[PDB]
Amino acid sequence: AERGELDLTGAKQNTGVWLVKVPKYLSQQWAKASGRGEVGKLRIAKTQGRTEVSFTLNEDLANEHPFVLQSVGGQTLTVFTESSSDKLSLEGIVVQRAECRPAASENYMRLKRLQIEESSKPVRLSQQLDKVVT
Amino acid sequence: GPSSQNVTEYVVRVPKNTTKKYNIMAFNAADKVNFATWNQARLERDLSNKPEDQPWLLRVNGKSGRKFKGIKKGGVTENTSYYIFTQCPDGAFEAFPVHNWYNFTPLARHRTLTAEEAEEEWERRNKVLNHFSIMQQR
Amino acid sequence: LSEKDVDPVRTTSNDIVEIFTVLGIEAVRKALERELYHVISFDGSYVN
Amino acid sequence: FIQMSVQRIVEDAPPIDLQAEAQHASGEVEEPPRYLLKFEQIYLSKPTHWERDGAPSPMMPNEARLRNLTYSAPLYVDITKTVIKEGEEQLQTQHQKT
Amino acid sequence: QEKMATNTVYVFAKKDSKYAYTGECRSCLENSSRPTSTIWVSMLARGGQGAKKSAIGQRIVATLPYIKQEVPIIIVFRALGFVSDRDILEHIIYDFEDPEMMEMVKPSLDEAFVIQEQNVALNFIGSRGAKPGVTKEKRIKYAKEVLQKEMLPHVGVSDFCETKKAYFLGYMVHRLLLAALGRRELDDRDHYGNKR
Amino acid sequence: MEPDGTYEPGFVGIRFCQECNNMLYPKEDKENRILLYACRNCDYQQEADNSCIYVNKITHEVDELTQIIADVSQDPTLPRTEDHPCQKCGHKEAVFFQSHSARAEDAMRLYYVCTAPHCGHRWTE
Amino acid sequence: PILEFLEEWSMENLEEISPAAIADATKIFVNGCWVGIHKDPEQLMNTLRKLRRQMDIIVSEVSMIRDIREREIRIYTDAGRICRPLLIVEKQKLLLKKRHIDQLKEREYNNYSWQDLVASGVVEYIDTLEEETVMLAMTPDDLQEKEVAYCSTYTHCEIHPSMILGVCASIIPFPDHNQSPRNTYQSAMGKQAMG
Amino acid sequence: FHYAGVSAKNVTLGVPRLKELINISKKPKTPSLTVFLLGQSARDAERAKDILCRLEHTTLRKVTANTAIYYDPNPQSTVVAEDQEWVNVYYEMPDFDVARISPWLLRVELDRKHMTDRKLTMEQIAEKINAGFGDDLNCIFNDDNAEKLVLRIRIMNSDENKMQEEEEVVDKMDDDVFLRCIESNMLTDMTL
Ligand SMILES: [Zn+2]
Numbered sequence A: 001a002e003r004g005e006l007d008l009t010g011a012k013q014n015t016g017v018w019l020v021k022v023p024k025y026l027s028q029q030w031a032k033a034s035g036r037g038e039v040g041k042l043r044i045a046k047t048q049g050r051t052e053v054s055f056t057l058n059e060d061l062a063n064e065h066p067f068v069l070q071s072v073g074g075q076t077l078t079v080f081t082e083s084s085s086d087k088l089s090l091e092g093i094v095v096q097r098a099e100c101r102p103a104a105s106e107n108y109m110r111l112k113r114l115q116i117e118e119s120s121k122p123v124r125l126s127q128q129l130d131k132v133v134t
Numbered sequence B: 001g002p003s004s005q006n007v008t009e010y011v012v013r014v015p016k017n018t019t020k021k022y023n024i025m026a027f028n029a030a031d032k033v034n035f036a037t038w039n040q041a042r043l044e045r046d047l048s049n050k051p052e053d054q055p056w057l058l059r060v061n062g063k064s065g066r067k068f069k070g071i072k073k074g075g076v077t078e079n080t081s082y083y084i085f086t087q088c089p090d091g092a093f094e095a096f097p098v099h100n101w102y103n104f105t106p107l108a109r110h111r112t113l114t115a116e117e118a119e120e121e122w123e124r125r126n127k128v129l130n131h132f133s134i135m136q137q138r
Numbered sequence C: 001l002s003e004k005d006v007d008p009v010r011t012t013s014n015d016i017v018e019i020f021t022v023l024g025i026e027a028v029r030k031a032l033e034r035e036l037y038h039v040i041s042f043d044g045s046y047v048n
Numbered sequence D: 001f002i003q004m005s006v007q008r009i010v011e012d013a014p015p016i017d018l019q020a021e022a023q024h025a026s027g028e029v030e031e032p033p034r035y036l037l038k039f040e041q042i043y044l045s046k047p048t049h050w051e052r053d054g055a056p057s058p059m060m061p062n063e064a065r066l067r068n069l070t071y072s073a074p075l076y077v078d079i080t081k082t083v084i085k086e087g088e089e090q091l092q093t094q095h096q097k098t
Numbered sequence E: 001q002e003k004m005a006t007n008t009v010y011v012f013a014k015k016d017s018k019y020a021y022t023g024e025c026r027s028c029l030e031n032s033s034r035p036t037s038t039i040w041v042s043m044l045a046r047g048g049q050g051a052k053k054s055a056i057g058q059r060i061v062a063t064l065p066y067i068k069q070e071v072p073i074i075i076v077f078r079a080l081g082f083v084s085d086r087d088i089l090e091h092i093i094y095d096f097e098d099p100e101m102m103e104m105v106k107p108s109l110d111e112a113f114v115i116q117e118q119n120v121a122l123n124f125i126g127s128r129g130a131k132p133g134v135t136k137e138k139r140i141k142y143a144k145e146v147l148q149k150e151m152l153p154h155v156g157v158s159d160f161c162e163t164k165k166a167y168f169l170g171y172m173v174h175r176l177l178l179a180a181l182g183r184r185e186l187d188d189r190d191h192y193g194n195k196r
Numbered sequence F: 001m002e003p004d005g006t007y008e009p010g011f012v013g014i015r016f017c018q019e020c021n022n023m024l025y026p027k028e029d030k031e032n033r034i035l036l037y038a039c040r041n042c043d044y045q046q047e048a049d050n051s052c053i054y055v056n057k058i059t060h061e062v063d064e065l066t067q068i069i070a071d072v073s074q075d076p077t078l079p080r081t082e083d084h085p086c087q088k089c090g091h092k093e094a095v096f097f098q099s100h101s102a103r104a105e106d107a108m109r110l111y112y113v114c115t116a117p118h119c120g121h122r123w124t125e
Numbered sequence G: 001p002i003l004e005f006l007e008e009w010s011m012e013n014l015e016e017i018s019p020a021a022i023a024d025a026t027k028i029f030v031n032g033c034w035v036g037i038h039k040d041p042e043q044l045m046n047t048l049r050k051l052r053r054q055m056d057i058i059v060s061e062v063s064m065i066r067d068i069r070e071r072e073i074r075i076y077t078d079a080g081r082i083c084r085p086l087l088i089v090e091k092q093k094l095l096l097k098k099r100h101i102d103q104l105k106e107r108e109y110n111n112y113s114w115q116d117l118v119a120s121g122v123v124e125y126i127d128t129l130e131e132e133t134v135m136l137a138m139t140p141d142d143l144q145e146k147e148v149a150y151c152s153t154y155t156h157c158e159i160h161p162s163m164i165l166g167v168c169a170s171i172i173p174f175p176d177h178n179q180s181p182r183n184t185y186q187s188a189m190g191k192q193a194m195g
Numbered sequence H: 001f002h003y004a005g006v007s008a009k010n011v012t013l014g015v016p017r018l019k020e021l022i023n024i025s026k027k028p029k030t031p032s033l034t035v036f037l038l039g040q041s042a043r044d045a046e047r048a049k050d051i052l053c054r055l056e057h058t059t060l061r062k063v064t065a066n067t068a069i070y071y072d073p074n075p076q077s078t079v080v081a082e083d084q085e086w087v088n089v090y091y092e093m094p095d096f097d098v099a100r101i102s103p104w105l106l107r108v109e110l111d112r113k114h115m116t117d118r119k120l121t122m123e124q125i126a127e128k129i130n131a132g133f134g135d136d137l138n139c140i141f142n143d144d145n146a147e148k149l150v151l152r153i154r155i156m157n158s159d160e161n162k163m164q165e166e167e168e169v170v171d172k173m174d175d176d177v178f179l180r181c182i183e184s185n186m187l188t189d190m191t192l
């Protein structure tokens, strides 16, 4: 037992978790939902030889996100945590990777373009300066 | 069975704050990691640069097990985000933000290469004339 | 030149440094005149 | 060049700081004075000429050729000086237009 | 004013010199720090120490900025932190199933063996470049500063894109090696596609 | 035996080390007639399979239906042909071209790529 | 913004992968910089082309090229590339129609202009690197003739061939009945003709 | 350029030749000799072919179809089962020092058309290489009527003196690697 030792319990329990890439507006809505205890629901529907995963947004937070699964045979991921109680722990192994994609296509772009406006717009050169004397 | 028309739905929680910060620990598949052998491990900040600005040093099963170095994700998720999705006993999902992504790679054990005493000099003479014997004379 | 069945009389070169080493200064005088003669005839114009 | 590059260059990466060698041979108690300067918004008038009087006027590109002037315009920038001393005060910042 | 284009790799023949082939890459944020441009990745030719294995036309080296002498590219990779050949070759070969290329890279790995550690590899680059001094550790710091800032600045200037930079070197070796098998045609010196 | 037997004894560069992942080199055991491959920086050694460790100049890895990736067929500037019957699918529309390689070598022989999704199949003439 | 769009679309970052497990993918470059890899270049290339013609990506400042025999896609947004306007032909026909011509004649009192014409996405600016990949047709005539001709794959079309001429070679009449060095000699003398 | 016969990647023409000639250049851009032939060789194509062959500076690298290096200590159990007949063929070829030959094997494959054009024989090559490197380089070869042309090479030593007297004045050079140096030099040097 020591401060430099890592807790392996999670690893030894074979705990599996999912890793998902998501677009900024969704993370921004979750940052606006703060911690109310819901942001929406995740739905998984499997067939005879096909499995389909998706997320659907909360009506309130809005006031279908399909998931694409990615091979994990190329890299091995687990997760560790750095507690405020200074006690490091290995929580589990990453058993799945995925990417959250938008369902809207072109309209979206405008939001993005609006998003572009939000990221890109401090005043550059932009306005001469008429004529000063002092 | 129902398994061929099974529909499942879970709630998603995103707590505003957590006592512990959340990290990724990533390994190459090529590295053939085996967590069953990880009887013990240590996790300490690296010492080459001699805290929150330095790479990580991972020591498993101490000096006998494997030793790895951890480097911080150089890229930044400015247009994306990474989240962990976890199942909870109540029947819902919890999602946690990735505070950092660290890339872990094997250091070597007693491979041993001084490369300082006269190896630079021996290189001037090097005609691939020898290889085993110089490593041994240490 | 030293090889069998190669005519040791007419065998010649467009090179001049080598003609000097093997055949000696008079042969260079002839060969060098010939090589200059040869570039001039090609270009079609005649020089006296 | 005017709309992006010039503004980009002065905004970019030359913030500067300066600090005298106080507490020399002795000192103590508090402050080795330090000063920080940073450049921001940039301004560019219409082309102007200044008569010997000092009176500024609208220049015309033909007038520039017959008298041999130089058809150019004056450039001005927002500069800030930013007094965060080693303790007693962190704010005493001043806006200029230069 | 017409110039030859920036931050793009070209593989061209230079049969008149000791280099069999060269990869030139002029690197610059013509809208960034506006410093300089350099890196050459070169395939050697015409030579033989005697009974080394001989064959000089696989002995790939790299000219770096500020460095006074040519250094083998594998040494630069080992200075970036990678130590295992498979990983350098993974950075290099992608397809993994080209045994021909693997033997082509093989003498460079054979030359690497003396500096298999990062620190000494850095010190090697230091001695090849800096002024002679007993400041080994400082010399390593200087060497580190060159590879981070002065090599391929258009790839990055910070720790945070030091790994990414290693992928780009592998692309410069790959592109060079591709021209040397003849699987890819050479880049013409005077194609406007390569000018600004 | 026969001269028809292909020439691919296994060129083989990598099967590198299993421990430190560096390159293996041949080395002798005069005692058991066995080749071994050893990492130069560690004590690991293992026997080789084939006695072959190097070959040079197949002089004809004609490379006629390899490396030429099938996505080449989407290229609009390559000549589509009415010349029919891909040798796999019952559809024409082969895209064709010379050499495409600097060992051009001197080839004038055409290479044909079927362009419909049912093949991707390639073949020389 | 180009880097942003690709990152949200599908392009995997270089550190997200192990090369020996995904090296087969098409490579992506932005101003000579290797940003990542992609497993479907034809759709993405088609989409980027669709955006640039839709004005979501700055047309005059962005070139986009696919080199299919090396399975990589480089895009350039740098200054100093020479590019020219060309017509976009699709389905083996012009995308520009007579309705636009009557709209252009209308400008004597209409505010409709060349910029509107580019936004119709019937013309694109094509730089020399990209000009290496197009199948450019000399005239609409040839593009019609194609039913008997060898090529039926055109992508762009010349707005007119005499435009390959610079200012001084343009003052001179019937230049093609001139033996070619005569055209160079006039262009010089043209600067010396006083007026 | 003036197209003529087969040649004409020949003799620099004009002012560049005037500069080349008048400077007394040590390194002309295109040096040549016009060689004339005598006897039957002045009127027969095949005779001319024979003299040309003697003149043509061919090196073994130009001639070789292929090379391979094999690990085979004892021939009488060859790793290449098809080679097994030469072992039947070559058991009496210095039968004592099969106990001395190195277990590293070099194999060369030759093209029959290219070997024909030089009108060269396998015995002349074996004798040329043997004479150049010395008795140390132990060479044997195949039947000229085989459909595959092969040269089989091992390396021998001086027997008596090599018993690890001090540490073997070679500094333990790898023998495969030395065999590559033989292959490097054997091809690049041998002026058959
Ligand atoms: Zn090893």
Ligand SMILES: [Zn+2]
Pocket (backbone or CB within 6 Å): F086, F087, F088, F089, F090, F091, F114, F115, F116, F118, F119, F120, F121
């Ligand atoms: Zn087909």
